[PDB]
Amino acid sequence: SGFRKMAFPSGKVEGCMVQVTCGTTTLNGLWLDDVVYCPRHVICTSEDMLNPNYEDLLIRKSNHNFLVQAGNVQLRVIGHSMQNCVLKLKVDTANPKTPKYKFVRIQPGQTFSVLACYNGSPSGVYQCAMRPNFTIKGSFLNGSCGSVGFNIDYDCVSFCYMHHMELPTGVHAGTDLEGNFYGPFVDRQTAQAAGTDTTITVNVLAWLYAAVINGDRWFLNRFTTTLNDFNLVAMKYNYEPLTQDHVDILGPLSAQTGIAVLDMCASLKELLQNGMNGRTILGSALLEDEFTPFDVVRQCSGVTFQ
Amino acid sequence: SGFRKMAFPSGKVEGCMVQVTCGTTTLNGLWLDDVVYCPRHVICTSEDMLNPNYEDLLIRKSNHNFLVQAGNVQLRVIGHSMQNCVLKLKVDTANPKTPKYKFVRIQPGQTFSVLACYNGSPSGVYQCAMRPNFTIKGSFLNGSCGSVGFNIDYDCVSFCYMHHMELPTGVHAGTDLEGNFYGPFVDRQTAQAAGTDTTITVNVLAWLYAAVINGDRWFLNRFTTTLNDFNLVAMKYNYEPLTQDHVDILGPLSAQTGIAVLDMCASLKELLQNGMNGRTILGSALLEDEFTPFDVVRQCSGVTFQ
Ligand SMILES: *C(=N)[C@H](C[C@@H]1CCNC1=O)NC(=O)[C@@H]1[C@@H]2[C@H](CN1C(=O)[C@@H](NC(=O)C(F)(F)F)C(C)(C)C)C2(C)C
Ligand SMILES: *C(=N)[C@H](C[C@@H]1CCNC1=O)NC(=O)[C@@H]1[C@@H]2[C@H](CN1C(=O)[C@@H](NC(=O)C(F)(F)F)C(C)(C)C)C2(C)C
């Protein structure tokens, strides 16, 4: 028993972290086989930030201008190119610690672990969700760019996020490993704001199932609801609409607990309309929306990674 | 910016995890140099649980009775001994991935990361505190015993916890790496309950400093208090007494923010007496007590590990 925000083990990723310095800027890079991937802003000076011309700045750099270090060892760069907002630096040595991996673009509402790094060295690991507004609620400082987000499926690391930038109110934005931003953001120091966020309904439902599995059952009521009526309430409380695909994905937890998804929707509706009256669920006074149905199943069943 | 419950990177620990099977029971072990450390209950059958005689059960096992596997490789056991509640299995191969390490006994109020494992394979990593009642609020299932808790200081892993057992209400108990339990608990399936827990005051104060550093300042009031008057209030709300040692440890955060510790005590006193009136601090509706002053400094300054 017990339920905690859990991150994936970070060792496979730690093995791939390096530091990249160009001129005076140092940030993190991801070394897979013989290529180091990093944010393209490593080539910028403090000056260049308001409106950088990356293509232009990259023309005047050669391979030797990039100082890549893996631990205490310099990796010689033998090629470079830019793909969207990331740079790919070909090095003369393949990383012997490269895990089996994929580059994936995740969808909003999905979760991943972030290995926060500074100067190519790991600082910590935590679990995040891609918010509906394409930001993440992270913990990043100057020098954290190039830190990555990932998921693990058995022995395979799916890299889904590279950190680039911090938006007003302390939320974070970045790209996929092909350098394409999540959301309508650009890597320049200009006026940018995230859209209004929304609550990830299917994840809240998943977490209520987690509460039931742990014996925290007080919020279960005696009613049911249609999907449409539930969504009318969810809308009012800035919750995203629950789709039939979401209902289907909740199937394993619904079958395990014997609580129909629409019955648990009726219970959530009551929590939204009435509040929790000073009670907690799994120790939380607010409804939690950064556990997916798969996260819940994975944690409550002890899924491991090779 | 941003503040998240962050765990230490787990790679050094992942490198040390193995599976131990004796008879029909399988749990996790920690392989350091040529010794595998695991919970002594691996030698018990389902039967033996109410009142095992461990010394007796261990007499009738020889080295070959323990099947240790590191990934897909069996490690031959060449010696065994029991130290308190843990077994030490000498193997014929030293673990090449052994990190620099120490065994430490932590104090209540201190935090650590847990690498939750099943069958010698990691499932997830999360951050915990040793509660004042000597339990931890974890997430563990059948087969998780032998999972360890740890801290990292540069390149050195300080192992402080081995998981043994789950207490009523889904809280967890275990030992240090010398096999001595934290708290008044024993490794037998008998009626056991944790004492009443208390809130870790110095950690709540640390987290309020974290909020200030992040710009969440609404709870700062205009007052001060003596240490004694503060402790009279803390007592009433089941908060542990704040000691001068705790005040001193908050010194770096107090100096960074310019808020005297006793001034922030006055603000905490008001939160305890008045509540938060539906407001949040760092996104939380409850006061958080599982960040130490060092955790806050470490996270807000980007401390990395070698
Ligand atoms: C990467 N190391 C930093 C990480 C930031 C620093 C503070 N917390 C972070 O996550 N990334 C940057 O400094 C990027 C980078 C220029 C500016 N920048 C920002 O994150 C800025 N934000 C924006 O401009 C905004 F709001 F539009 F996202 C800053 C005001 C410094 C937080 C480039 C090239 C985008
Ligand atoms: C180790 N793999 C399991 C981990 C437990 C299982 C459920 N969640 C956990 O953390 N450890 C055990 O099964 C230990 C072990 C006998 C029983 N036991 C317990 O944890 C039991 N708890 C107690 O007896 C109590 F309450 F006194 F702590 C159980 C009721 C199964 C949760 C031994 C040898 C202590």
UniProtKB/Swiss-Prot annotation, chains A, B:
Catalytic reaction equation(s): TSAVLQ-|-SGFRK-NH2 and SGVTFQ-|-GKFKK the two peptides corresponding to the two self-cleavage sites of the SARS 3C-like proteinase are the two most reactive peptide substrates. The enzyme exhibits a strong preference for substrates containing Gln at P1 position and Leu at P2 position
Protein name as annotated: 3C-like proteinase nsp5
Subcellular localization: Host cytoplasm; Host Golgi apparatus; Host nucleus
Known function: Cleaves the C-terminus of replicase polyprotein at 11 sites. Recognizes substrates containing the core sequence [ILMVF]-Q-|-[SGACN]. Cleaves and inactivates human TRMT1, preventing tRNA guanine(26)-dimethylation of tRNAs. May cleave human NLRP1 in lung epithelial cells, thereby activating the NLRP1 inflammasome pathway. May cleave human GSDMD, triggering alternative GSDME-mediated epithelial cell death upon activation of the NLRP1 inflammasome, which may enhance the release interleukins 1B, 6, 16 and 18. Also able to bind an ADP-ribose-1''-phosphate (ADRP).
Cross-link Glycyl lysine isopeptide (Lys-Gly) (interchain with G-Cter in ubiquitin) residue location(s): 5, 90
Taxon lineage: Viruses, Riboviria, Orthornavirae, Pisuviricota, Pisoniviricetes
Phenotype when changing residue 49 to A: Does not affect ability to cleave and inactivate human TRMT1
Active site: 41, 145
Cytoplasmic side: 1-306
Activity regulation description: Inhibited by pyridone-containing alpha-ketoamides compounds 13a and 13b. In turn, alpha-ketoamide 13b (tert-butyl (1-((S)-1-(((S)-4-(benzylamino)-3,4-dioxo-1-((S)-2-oxopyrrolidin-3-yl)butan-2-yl)amino)-3-cyclopropyl-1-oxopropan-2-yl)-2-oxo-1,2-dihydropyridin-3-yl)carbamate) inhibits SARS-CoV-2 replication in human lung cells. Inhibited ex vivo by michael acceptor inhibitor N3. Inhibited ex vivo by compound 11a and 11b.
Outcome of swapping residue 189 to A: Does not affect ability to cleave and inactivate human TRMT1
Effect of residue 90 to R: In strain: Beta/B.1.351
Domain Peptidase C30: 1-306
Effect noted on mutating residue 145 to A: Complete loss of 3C-like proteinase nsp5 cleavage
Subunit structure, interactors included: 3CL-PRO exists as monomer and homodimer. Only the homodimer shows catalytic activity. Interacts with host FBXO22; this interaction promotes the proteasomal degradation of nsp5.
Taxonomic superkingdom: Viruses
Signal sequence, renumbered to the chain: none
